[PDB]
C-alpha cells in the first residue's frame, strides 16, 4: 500500500541522514521519532506556504515565496546552500 511505501521511504531517508551525521546505529524509537518529525515538518511547511502565498496576487507560488515562508518559520536559509552541496554526495543503502 501507499502509506507503507511512504513510511519505508522516510525510514531510508532518516537512515541516510543519520549515517551522514556520523551515526552507525540508532535505537528504533529514535528512528521512529525522526521519521514522524520529518513528515510533520514537510506538512508544516505546506501549511505555512499555503497561508503565505494566499496573500500574493500570483496564482503560482514562486521560489521567493517559499524562501520567505521558511524565514517566517524561523528556518535559517543562509545555511542551506552549503548543506545542499554535502547532501548531493549523500548515498542511500
Amino acid at each position: 500500500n501507499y502509506h507503507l511505501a511512504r513510511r519505508r521511504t522516510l525510514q531510508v531517508v532518516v537512515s541516510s541522514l543519520l549515517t551522514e551525521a556520523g551515526f552507525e546505529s540508532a535505537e528504533k524509537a529514535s528512528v521512529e521519532t525522526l521519521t514522524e518529525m520529518l513528515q510533520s515538518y514537510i506538512s508544516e511547511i505546506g501549511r505555512s506556504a499555503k497561508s503565505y502565498c494566499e496573500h500574493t496576487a500570483r496564482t503560482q507560488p514562486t521560489l521567493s515565496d517559499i524562501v520567505v515562508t521558511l524565514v517566517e518559520m524561523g528556518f535559517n536559509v543562509d545555511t542551506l546552500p552549503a548543506y545542499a552541496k554535502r547532501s548531493q554526495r549523500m548515498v542511500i543503502t
Partner: protein, 86 residues
Amino acid sequence: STPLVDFLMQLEDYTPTIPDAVTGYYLNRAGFEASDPRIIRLISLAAQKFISDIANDALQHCKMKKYTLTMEDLTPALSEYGINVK
C-alpha cells in the same frame, strides 16, 4: 556574493534524498501545491536539513559521555519542538 540565488537556480540539478513525490504528497495534504519542481526540491532539502540539524545536535550530546543514536541524546535535541509555549 549571491550564494543563495546560485543555490536556488541549480535546484533543478539536485536530486534530494526525499523523492519529489513524497514531499509533494505531504505538501498537497496540507493543501499546498506548486508546478515549479524547484519548489518541491527546496522544501525537500529544508526538511532534510531540519532533521540533520537535530541529528548533529544529538551527536554533540552523544559526544558528552562507533556512534549510536539513543533517545537519551535525541530527547534534549527536541526541546524547541515540543508543546507550544506561550
